Design a protein around this ligand. Structure first.
Ligand SMILES: [Mg+2]
Ligand SMILES: [Mg+2]
Ligand SMILES: [Mg+2]
Ligand SMILES: [Mg+2]
Lengths: 289, 289, 289, 289
């Protein structure tokens, strides 16, 4: 299991400087892995990232959220094709980095829909995601669909829905990515989604109810980690936090990061790293007693 | 204290038949009060409402959410003026009904903004709301701003933000409206917001994390009700839950109701009424032991 | 599933008067079943119980805790035999009532031990309970061991320890009884013990952390009922509450009931009956949405 | 604020070697303070303790529970006197160590009583404690009464009982010591007792529901630390944990430590030190957001 940190803790612009900076700060915070948010994978400087990752002995993953122009759940085949094109490039980036995990909101646009998903749209989404997963499979890359709340997608809001989505595709490298922040809204509790989704659970985001400091919100982390321990989850556990102190020109607007949740990402990162690691340490003793 | 139920539980269209139906269902479910959604107050059948309320001996309140055309936080004075007009009419409706509580998202549009709030926008919102409060005050009507999550507003996301907003306006009849559903995301916990806004807390919405049956989600209702009891809150406590089958396509899309958490609103309403009253009965015993 | 009330809500003396009083009050509070504490089954008035149960249409179960004189976990064979004799009579009483469930602290004395259990004592406990269970089996009676906290036994303090104890005996009518009050102290959380004990779980006590009003202490009922729902538990669910306003001469002392947690047991009882039934109703809805 | 560790994490025998071992391990785990259990203060090697404390740079406090022979709530004045004598020696040991804090179950025996307290016994307890406090005051020592559960005292089971007991004595150095383990049983929630005891709260124990690893049981630490932050508590915050792995001949039997909750106290101790510190760090951030 790799303990990771989302890139938006450190910077909103993933240029050469942002890449080295995020990688460095991640390592200094005590994390094993950095998750790069690849909103624009075409321009992502792979060589700099490879250099920085090697320098700090850090692993990497990639996440992304689609938009209207790249909505794979669209009824417009051209829009779907564009989204598929973007997803494929992200996967290519991961392959060049020698990474293994791609995740995020890749089954739809990451936004507040003003209509329910349509039958035709859902068919297009599943087909597009199937083709990306197949391609990723040949490159030795896993693809995990991140379940997000009603305001960020109209397709997959719960673990159960994600399981039904994956049932049709039946792709071996296709998994489910759960996020405590999103689970806090949609799920019935923190243990049930883990247990139902146990086979497919491939990626985990650790986020507080307001996406700030861990333990300063309403998320039931204790039940979540205990359930993770029960199913013997051994995949990535990545801290994710957003504040107006670190702004991504598009991503911050899309996630509605209006408020200040923290000013000092160094204290935040180190704290989050310890929070996650110590929780896992304690949870490991539970089976013994 | 009045135990209430949002009208949207029962019907999506508040015409003559809808008004009578929602009022009757509310009374049959055991509630003291019904909250009418006045999205369009100009076409609200006030007379039918007065009749139905008297028939069932039920109290009433009103809430609405603004839209793009009536966004009082806009930098466009034409838009701001439109919103203020909508607000003023709603207040007139309540005055006619002899009701005393107006609430909801009246300081901004109820939607997912793609940009942070602006200084000019905030100024316009505050000015308009102040004028509306003054108008309402003369009609003996209290106005409560409902704190909502980041996806429904970029203005008032926390109880403290609402306090700062109210401090500037310094209006006697201006209150704070808290909703457990929204609190469950943005707030640090369920007792701090109650304690901090005790002086200004005038309206309460009771909703599960996913707006389904009470007690089937992640809302810490226990801490919330304990906090309410500690500050001796005596205002309205109103249940809120939504179904795409029941509400209009407009509002269902606005609230992002992609899933239906219940099929029988009679059972839901009766369950919610007992949940609230029974919780209140229990919390009253705490001071005795 | 039968919803029940422990008799110490109503009376501490099960003479004929207490028997009829407890039965009647249980029916009036809305329950299906009364749980008689048979601290002395030799003198329990079976005849009055049968008569009251019939008059009020109520099912019945019974529980008890052993004492030093009846400690089947003693190394002294005469003490063990006196215990076994008491247990056997309790099973016989239940048989005469037409009941199906015996439970409680029947594997040791119900007290604060000052020494750990002993290998010889444990073997005595199991053998006696095995014989009691076999006897009960012939009579169509299920026997469930109540897991209780460290101050009330030194043998079975967690669900896991009860499973290991049963594994040895391999009896098909021998089950596990979990109590939220006891779980709240000893267990890692409120779902694991249910999931681990699924096969063997046959009786449930619903008690708040301080054994008063439900929802006025720190017990996580939500996690507990969600887990009960997940495994399809259909055994008895019995409210259990103790206050200085209702005193049993021995039992109130043994359980350390020093404080007033309630004066009005009719309010308490109706509240608890609603709490449990409403919780089960809500959990059933998680299924389909 | 001093973050501390109870000595029973390390050893059950406070001979010279035990004293040195406990102080060393406490320092190595990252704590500021060691809490000595002074069950027999007449035989406690003060000089070795001064030496070990100095060597490792550690502050110190002491606690004890009384027994039958020393029960200051007894109606027998010789028993009261013997208790008061043991208390006075414990204060002296602290004075010689240059410490400021005495605490624990010093207002009754620390045991499972078999009947409720008596008016006369209470009056003896209060007088004795008052005298011990006055003596302590002259030496610059604060005395804090540990509120414990029903199975360890019949006198002070809730914060509010302790408040009422202090009110009578009105002593300026006499405070309330709350323990999350005990609160988890007897209190209504984890914030009310903190808010109610605010001015009088002088000492804190941090204990999981089953007294093992922090975050592996049912204690609501988040509400507790958020309430602590709210009243700006600055007294000692001390980790307390018990396992059959490390046994005190007397104390482990009195506390009912039947089960192994950990084998490796070095891991346990560093986990707890981090747990408490990291929680305080996070709670500090809440007022900023
Ligand atoms: Mg995420
Ligand atoms: Mg609302
Ligand atoms: Mg019980
Ligand atoms: Mg303690």
């Amino acid at each position: 299991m790799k303990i990771g940190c989302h890139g938006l803790v450190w910077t909103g612009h993933f240029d050469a400087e942002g890449i080295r900076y995020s990688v460095q700060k991640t390592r200094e915070a005590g994390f094993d892995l950095v998750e790069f948010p690849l909103m624009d994978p075409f321009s992502f400087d792979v060589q700099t990232a490879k250099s920085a990752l090697a320098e700090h002995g850090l692993a990497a993953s990639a996440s992304l959220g689609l938009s209207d122009a790249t909505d794979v759940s669209s009824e417009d085949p051209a829009v779907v094709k564009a989204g598929e094109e973007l997803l494929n490039r992200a996967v290519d980036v991961l392959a060049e980095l020698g990474a293994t995990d791609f995740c995020g909101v890749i089954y739809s646009a990451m936004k507040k829909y003003m209509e329910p998903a349509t039958a035709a749209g859902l068919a297009n989404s599943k087909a597009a995601v199937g083709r990306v997963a197949d391609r990723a499979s040949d490159l030795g890359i896993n693809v995990s669909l991140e379940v997000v709340n009603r305001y960020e997608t109209n397709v997959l809001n719960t673990g159960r829905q994600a399981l039904a989505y994956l049932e049709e595709l039946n792709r071996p490298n296709l998994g489910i990515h759960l996020d405590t922040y999103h689970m806090n809204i949609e799920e019935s509790d923190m243990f049930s989604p883990i247990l139902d989704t146990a086979e497919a659970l491939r990626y985990v985001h650790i986020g507080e109810s307001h996406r700030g400091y861990l333990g300063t919100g309403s998320v039931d982390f204790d039940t979540f980690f205990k359930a993770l321990g029960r199913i013997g989850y051994d995949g990535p556990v990545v801290f994710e936090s957003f504040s107006s102190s670190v702004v991504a020109p598009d991503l911050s607007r899309m996630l509605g990061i209006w408020r200040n949740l923290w000013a000092d990402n160094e204290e935040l990162g180190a704290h989050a790293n310890a929070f996650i690691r110590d929780k896992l340490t304690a949870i490991k003793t539970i089976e013994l007693h």
